[PDB]
Design a protein around this ligand. Structure first.
Ligand code: ATP
Ligand code: GDP
Ligand code: MG
Lengths: 349, 192
């Protein structure tokens, strides 16, 4: 594994080499958004080693060479199912967190467009619907992630939560975050206000802002939610989706936008869809256009060997014949170097 | 030994199985008696005379070597082109195997021949399959790939593959439903 655990200093020489993430960093940075299987692996091994891969290295280099004066650049982690797109986004997130950016991290947009039972028409705007449970759940993890930067932000308007309760210009954004977290009915409006304030303050220069959205295609893919009349609800009618589209719009600077495509959890998209237009539809492609796609593919031989060595070091591959080169080749064939399939295979060996 | 029918044809006489057995036992005794050439040629009047085939290697546009084969399983039919060199990459209908066969069982079925002959990663393959389900297609592709690989592996390896069953077309197919019964063999619940 790498002796260089710094997210910013590790470079091409560390390709296919591991990279540790301390439990304190995990608690402070990833209350959400880690793949469930990787979370389970972390809990099992008491470690959070991520392999330094070429896509993550390239995206890190782009972010380092960015110029905050220009409007926020949109990068799109892209590729096949279970190739490490989400973990590459997590790597970039950890890098920026250690670089002291405000990380507006959406762990999975797909969760916001299905299964919601608390869906209600938004009081602030009857045209749109609110998702109080999801809003509060995201807000809690967002506060946990970026509490230190939260106090510094000065809100620029007066936001009324009722005819009697409001938050005033010059107040910390922590006030709005706490209001949304506590008063569940106002969580969606709090999330919208937070997105607005972060987007504008990044341009003002108050702080560097990294928007990091997984499953970005959900912002334009059809939703499975229904009205009271059993009628389908378009994605924009959700307040969270509307505000996140506004955030994705590149009409701001002082930050960068990184989105990761994900067929998993997507609605009305075939399994073998991994191209950007195919996953995003034409609407989403034009919305995110222009953007820089970053491909993530199956492990190269060195990455495969490094991952196998990590598993052997942890003794995860308890199978007697797993260490043998025959077992190594069997795993390589069965997973075809796909990290997700290889992890699932090694899960029961 | 000529069957009783052949003996009857030769003797223009009807015979019983017991008579034929007696005659055959006498002939066996004659042969075992360490007889001469005249007796052996006389016995020849009554004596009656009773491996996998390898496809030919071909060369592509670049001249690189390959072999072609076909196989069938259930309703599935597949045709496989196995090249002499590669990184174990198998493209089914132009789709990589890991994406065409999400089922680890079918991926194992694809793996089986190369693993048997110790050639994991030593060849690339392009296969086209149709009909049948996922498992039928996997079996058909396995059979086609094994038959093609016979073009490269040694004869000992080919015989070992046959003995392992990689080169036998599985005759097991669906059995027609018969009238008056639920399925191929499931009779209706006997009423009382
Ligand atoms: N860079 C990496 N370092 C460590 N593990 C990785 C890496 N990339 C993938 N993995 C492994 O694969 C899984 C992570 O894959 P990930 O969740 O990113 O999939 P994805 O392809 O981006 O998209 P999806 O699976 O949602 O289609 C985990 O089990 C993890 O162990
Ligand atoms: N309840 C409430 N929500 C607000 C307020 N200001 C902004 N928001 C949130 O942000 C949204 C308004 O965003 P804005 O940039 O004004 O554009 P709009 O969404 O098109 O009206 C609302 O729908 C809320 O989600 C406010 O004063 N009260
Ligand atoms: Mg993923």
């Amino acid at each position: 594994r790498t002796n260089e655990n710094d997210p910013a200093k590790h470079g091409d020489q560390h390709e296919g080499q591991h990279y540790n993430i301390s439990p304190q960093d995990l608690e402070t940075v990833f209350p959400h958004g880690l793949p469930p299987r990787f979370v389970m692996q972390v809990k099992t091994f008491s470690e959070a080693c991520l392999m330094v891969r070429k896509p993550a290295l390239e995206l890190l280099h782009y972010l380092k060479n960015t110029s905050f004066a220009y409007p926020a650049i949109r990068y799109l982690l892209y590729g096949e199912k279970g190739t490490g797109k989400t973990l590459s986004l997590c790597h970039v997130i950890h890098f920026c967190a250690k670089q002291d950016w405000l990380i507006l991290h959406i762990p999975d947009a797909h969760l916001w467009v299905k299964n919601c039972r608390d869906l209600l028409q938004s009081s602030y705007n009857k045209q749109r619907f609110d998702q109080p449970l999801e809003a509060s759940t995201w807000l809690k993890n967002f506060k946990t992630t970026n509490e230190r930067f939260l106090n510094q932000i000065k809100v620029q308007e007066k936001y009324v939560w009722n005819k009697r309760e409001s938050t005033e210009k010059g107040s910390p954004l922590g006030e709005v975050v706490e209001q949304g977290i506590t008063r569940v009915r106002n969580a969606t409006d709090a999330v919208g206000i937070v997105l607005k304030e972060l987007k504008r303050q990044s341009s003002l220069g108050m702080f560097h802002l990294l928007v990091a959205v997984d499953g970005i295609n959900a912002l334009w893919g059809r939703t499975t939610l229904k009205r009271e009349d059993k009628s389908p609800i378009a994605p924009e009618e959700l307040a969270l989706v509307h505000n996140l589209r506004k955030m994705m719009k590149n009409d701001w600077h002082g930050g960068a936008i990184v989105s990761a495509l994900s067929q998993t959890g997507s609605l009305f998209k075939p399994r073998k869809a991994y191209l950007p237009q195919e996953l995003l539809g034409k609407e989403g492609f034009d919305a995110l256009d222009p953007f820089i796609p970053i491909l993530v593919s199956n492990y190269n031989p060195k990455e495969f060997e490094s991952c196998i060595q990590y598993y052997l070091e942890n003794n995860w591959l308890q199978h007697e014949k797993a260490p043998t080169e025959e077992g190594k080749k069997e795993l390589l064939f069965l997973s075809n170097a796909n990290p997700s399939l290889l992890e699932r295979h090694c899960a029961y060996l | 030994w000529l069957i009783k029918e052949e003996l009857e044809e030769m003797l223009v006489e009807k015979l019983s199985d017991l008579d034929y057995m007696q005659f055959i036992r006498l002939l066996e005794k004659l042969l075992t008696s360490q007889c001469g050439a005249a007796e052996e040629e006389f016995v020849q009047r009554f004596r009656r005379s009773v491996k996998q085939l390898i496809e030919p290697v071909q060369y592509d546009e670049q001249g690189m070597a390959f072999s072609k084969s076909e196989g069938k399983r259930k309703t599935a039919k597949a045709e496989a082109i196995v090249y002499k060199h590669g990184s174990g990459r198998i493209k089914v209908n132009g789709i990589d195997y890991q994406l065409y066969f999400p089922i680890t069982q079918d991926r194992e079925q694809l793996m089986f021949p190369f693993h048997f002959v110790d050639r994991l990663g030593k060849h690339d393959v392009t296969c086209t399959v149709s009909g049948g389900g996922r498992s039928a297609q996997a079996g058909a592709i396995r059979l086609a790939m094994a038959k093609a690989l016979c073009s490269f592996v040694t004869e000992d390896e080919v015989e070992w593959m046959r003995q392992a069953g990689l080169l036998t077309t599985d005759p097991r197919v669906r059995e027609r439903k018969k009238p008056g019964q639920e399925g191929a063999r499931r009779k209706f619940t006997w009423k009382k």
